[PDB]
Amino acid sequence: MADRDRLRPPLDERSLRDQLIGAGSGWRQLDVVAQTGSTNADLLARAASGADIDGVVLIAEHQTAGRGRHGRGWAATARAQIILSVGVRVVDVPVQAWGWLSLAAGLAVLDSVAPLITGLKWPNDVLARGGKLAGILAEVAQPFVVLGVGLNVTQAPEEVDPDATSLLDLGVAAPDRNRIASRLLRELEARIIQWRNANPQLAADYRARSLTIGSRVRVELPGGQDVVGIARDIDDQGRLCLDVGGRTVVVSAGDVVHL
Numbered sequence: 454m455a456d457r458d459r460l461r462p463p464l465d466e467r468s469l470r471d472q473l474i475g476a477g478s479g480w481r482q483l484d485v486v487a488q489t490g491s492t493n494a495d496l497l498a499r500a501a502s503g504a505d506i507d508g509v510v511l512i513a514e515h516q517t518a519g520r521g522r523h524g525r526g527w528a529a530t531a532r533a534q535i536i537l538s539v540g541v542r543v544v545d546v547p548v549q550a551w552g553w554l555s556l557a558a559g560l561a562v563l564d565s566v567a568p569l570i571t572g573l574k575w576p577n578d579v580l581a582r583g584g585k586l587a588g589i590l591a592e593v594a595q596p597f598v599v600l601g602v603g604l605n606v607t608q609a610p611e612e613v614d615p616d617a618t619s620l621l622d623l624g625v626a627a628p629d630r631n632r633i634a635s636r637l638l639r640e641l642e643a644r645i646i647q648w649r650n651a652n653p654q655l656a657a658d659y660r661a662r663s664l665t666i667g668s669r670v671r672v673e674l675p676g677g678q679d680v681v682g683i684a685r686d687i688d689d690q691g692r693l694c695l696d697v698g699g700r701t702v703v704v705s706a707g708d709v710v711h712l
C-alpha cells in the first residue's frame with residue numbers, strides 16, 4: 454500500500470496517444486488528468502456546456518469522488534486503476550438501445566485483460582475469481598451516453614473494497630497500465646462500432662463471458678423486495694429477463710445476487 458503507492462508509475466499520455474495514432478483510432482480526443490472528482494461527471498459537464506463529446510476519452514490517474522450506480526461510490530488511489538470515461542452520441546439512426554453500452558464496456562474490459570489472466574456479472578461488474586476487477590457505469594445525457602470504467606490494475610482490496618481484486622492480486626506480474634489502457638480503448642471502440650451496427654456478435658460475445666445468464670439469482674428491489682428465479686437472458690435493451698415459473702420479470706438495473 455505504501456509499498457504499492459511507491460511502485461505505481463504514471464501513465465505516459467504521449468504513448469497512449471502514439472498507440473491510437475499507429476492504430477488509426479477513431480477516438481476524437483484523449484486527455485489524462487492527475488486527479489478529478491469523477492471522469493463521468495466531467496464529460497457530462499462538458500456535454501452540458503455544449504461540447505461534442507462523441508469519441509472523447511478522459512482518463513484520470515486519481516479519482517476522489519467516484520460514482521457507482523444508483524448513488525453508490527467508487528473508490529481509488531492514485532495510479533492504481535485505469536479510470537476512464539468516453540462519450541458516445543446515441544441519437545443515431547437507426548437508434549440502438551443505449552442500455553447495451555455498459556455491457557459492451559464490460560466485455561471490452563474482459564477482452565483487454567484476457568491476454569494476462571471470471572466473466573461479466575450483470576449489470577455492472579467484471580469479476581475474476583469472484584472478486585470485482587472492474588466496474589462499469591453508463592449515464593445518459595441525451596444526445597450522449599457517458600460510459601465509465603474503473604479497472605483495478607494494482608489496486609489492493611484494502612485500499613478500495615474488501616470484495617475487490619486487481620490484475621496484480623490475480624498474479625499478473627507488473628501490469629503495464631499503458632499497454633492495457635491502449636488495448637482497452639481499441640476494444641471499446643470496436644464494441645461501440647458493433648453496437649451502432651446492431652451486430653449480433655456483440656450479444657453473442659457477451660453471453661460467452663456471462664456469469665449471470667443461466668444462473669439462479671435473486672433480484673433485489675427497493676423496499677426490501679426480492680424475486681428469485683432464473684436469469685433467462687439479456688434483452689435487446691440490456692435488461693435482465695428473470696424467469697419466475699414461466700412468467701417474466703424484466704429489470705432494467707439494480708442489484709442481482711448469484712445464489
Ligand SMILES: Nc1ncnc2c1ncn2[C@@H]1O[C@H](COP(=O)(O)OC(=O)CCCC[C@@H]2SC[C@@H]3NC(=O)N[C@@H]32)[C@@H](O)[C@H]1O
Pocket residue numbers: 490491492493494518519520521522523525526527528529536537538577578585586587588589590600601602603604605608613614616617618
Ligand atoms: N475500486 C473498486 N473495486 C471493486 N469494488 C469497488 C471499488 N470501489 C468501490 N467498490 C464497491 O463497488 C460498489 C459500487 O458498485 P456499483 O455496481 O454500484 O457501481 C459500479 O460498479 C460502477 C463503477 C463505475 C466506476 C467508473 S471509474 C470512471 C467513471 N467515473 C466514475 O465516477 N465512475 C466511473 C461500491 O459500493 C463498493 O462496494
